[PDB]
Write a protein that binds this ligand. Structure first.
Ligand SMILES: Cc1nnc2c3ccccc3c(-c3ccc(N4CCOCC4)c(NS(=O)(=O)c4ccccc4Cl)c3)nn12
Length: 113
């Protein structure tokens, strides 16, 4: 019963989340885990939130999904200093996502239908 966009986004989310085996990005980061996080990060984002939005038909374009994904990675690159696992992983995932979900690839996908 799922729509074309939900099926695609779900694919993108699964592929990107594969790159986070430890589950750092799976659920909202808490201050208990990451002290002061909420003083640095105004607009938190995580994979679980994104998945809920997919399921709930809240994304009306792939561009909207990309904005949340980029927000999640940006947040990690903002809270964490460059020499940390979290900043490094966020950079890698962002780069992969940006290529996988490029405007040219999305145009090809749309045209194929
Ligand atoms: C995403 C992201 N961006 N910055 C961070 C960050 C910065 C400092 C410390 C931790 C993080 C984490 C992070 C988020 C979740 C987790 N867990 C993954 C497995 O399920 C339990 C929760 C971890 N794991 S953890 O590295 O083992 C950890 C570190 C500090 C305190 C507690 C923990 Cl559990 C780390 N994720 N994160």
């Amino acid at each position: 019963e799922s729509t074309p966009i939900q099926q695609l986004l779900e694919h993108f989310l699964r592929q990107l989340q594969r790159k986070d085996p430890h589950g750092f990005f799976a659920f909202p980061v808490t201050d208990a885990i990451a002290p002061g996080y909420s003083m640095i990060i105004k607009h938190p984002m995580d994979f679980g939130t994104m998945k809920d939005k997919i399921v709930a038909n809240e994304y009306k374009s792939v561009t909207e999904f990309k904005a949340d994904f980029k927000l999640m990675c940006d947040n990690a690159m903002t809270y964490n200093r460059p020499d940390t696992v979290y900043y490094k992983l966020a950079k890698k995932i962002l780069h992969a996502g940006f290529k996988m979900m490029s405007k040219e690839r999305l145009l090809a996908l749309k045209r194929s239908m």
